[PDB]
């Protein structure tokens, strides 16, 4: 099989399209442009960009596409999938009283984030009178595959969970149905499952076969835990960025109300995680990254520094345990600027063994494994702090292009997440 990913990021969206019986690809690129009057057009326009970059031999032999967008972006549309306002970004707030949104959800849901889907459906119904019934909000990724199957109101399990859904029992509540903004609600889908057919006249004008099949999407996030391939219980990705990201495969949902941990349904599993303040901007604001591996090269990682540091880049942190106040330890200060390193690649370390550790304190399944992404992934040094510190084995990911885990999804749906 042949499978197409599109991934709509936040400065740019990328394809890949990958034979799985060859192993084969081709990846091509967009770039957004930073200011727009008409966001919609430049992401569509961005899709048919994606598509044109394609070599027709591939586009001809392209039997399954799924697309992820950005967890949070947001369309209000008419019945025709026009938007009839300017979208709400995943980083916008909405200036609304969350508990207005009590009886839709439940207790601690994910939902209840003033820059939730559910929180930017319910502002739009603020701003506007009486949203038409006939209308529907869309996440970025659910319009973008709507422009390829011509389905209203599609969307999969992992968008819609800020909107409200509860993916542990497979349903939107009945209050949240039933209300004025039940009739702008998407039928959910799991991430992976055919929705229909490509449309004709897309079909024809890009060369893709009319039996092509669209499927139901998923989150860029999510994607790029799908691109490591992993899919055991207690396998994790850790994302070594400018922040720290952990995702952990689990067997069981796990969730914390202070640090905002939540989980997102994988098939038969979940995927849990956090996000630290912590991350490879701390290290940025003291080295440059010519130096950070002309200074790595000289750390032994199985002498400890004696410095014990945490490596927050500004005040405040999130994840693994929540303080608004928490100021960034950076003393004391070694002579040695390769101590000082090793001092802040031990604290970047400490702060990811104590993020597994709480979320398997939570309930997830116990770590056996991580898969390593981002810019700290090819730091051994780093890596042999982490493997001392944590005791599970380490290894850079093979994958790690949202693009690639979307083309994955495509190909084989959400099927290796069950026993």
């Given at each position: 099989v042949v499978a197409l990913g599109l991934?709509?990021?936040?400065?740019?969206?990328?394809?890949?399209?990958?034979?799985?019986?060859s192993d084969r690809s081709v990846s091509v690129s967009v770039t957004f442009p930073k200011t727009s009057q008409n966001w919609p057009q430049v992401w569509r326009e961005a899709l048919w960009q994606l598509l044109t970059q394609i070599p027709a031999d591939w586009r001809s032999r392209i039997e399954r596409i799924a697309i992820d967008g950005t967890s949070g972006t947001v369309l209000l549309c008419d019945r025709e999938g026009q938007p009839q306002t300017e979208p709400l970004l995943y980083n916008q707030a909405c200036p609304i009283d969350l508990a207005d949104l009590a009886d839709w959800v439940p207790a601690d849901?994910?939902?209840?984030?003033?820059?939730?889907?559910?929180?930017?459906?319910?502002?739009?119904?603020?701003?506007?009178?009486?949203?038409?019934?006939?209308?529907?909000?869309?996440?970025?990724?659910?319009?973008?595959?709507?422009?390829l199957h011509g389905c209203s109101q599609q969307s999969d399990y992992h968008n819609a969970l800020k909107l409200g859904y509860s993916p542990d029992r497979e349903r939107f509540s009945k209050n949240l149905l039933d209300s004025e903004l039940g009739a702008l609600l998407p039928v959910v889908h799991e991430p992976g499952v055919a929705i229909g057919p490509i449309l004709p006249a897309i079909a024809q004008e890009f060369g893709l076969s009319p039996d092509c099949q669209i499927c139901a999407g998923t989150t860029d996030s999510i994607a790029a835990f799908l691109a490591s391939g992993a899919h055991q219980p207690g396998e994790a990705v850790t994302s070594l960025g400018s922040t720290i990201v952990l995702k952990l495969l689990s067997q069981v949902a796990v969730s914390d109300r202070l640090t905002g941990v939540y989980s997102h349904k994988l098939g038969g599993y979940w995927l849990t995680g956090g996000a630290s303040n912590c991350g490879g901007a701390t290290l940025r604001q003291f080295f440059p990254d010519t130096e950070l591996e002309s200074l790595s090269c000289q750390i032994?990682?199985?002498?400890?520094?004696?410095?014990?540091?945490?490596?927050?880049?500004?005040?405040?942190?999130?994840?693994?345990?929540?303080?608004?106040?928490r100021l960034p330890q950076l003393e004391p200060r070694p002579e040695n600027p390769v101590q000082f390193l090793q001092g802040l690649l031990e604290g970047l370390t400490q702060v990811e063994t104590l993020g597994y550790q709480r979320l398997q304190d939570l309930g997830a399944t116990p770590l056996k494994r991580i898969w390593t992404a981002g810019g700290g992934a090819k730091n051994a040094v780093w890596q042999q702090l982490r493997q001392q510190a944590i005791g599970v084995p380490i290894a850079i990911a093979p994958n790690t292009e949202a693009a690639f885990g979307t083309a994955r999804l495509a190909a084989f749906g959400l099927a290796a997440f069950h026993s």
């Open positions: 991934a709509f990021g936040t400065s740019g969206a990328r394809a890949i399209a990958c034979d799985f019986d849901h994910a939902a209840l984030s003033s820059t939730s889907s559910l929180a930017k459906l319910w502002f739009w119904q603020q701003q506007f009178g009486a949203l038409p019934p006939d209308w529907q909000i869309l996440a970025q990724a659910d319009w973008l595959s709507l422009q032994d990682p199985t002498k400890k520094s004696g410095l014990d540091y945490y490596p927050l880049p500004s005040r405040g942190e999130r994840f693994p345990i929540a303080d608004p106040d």
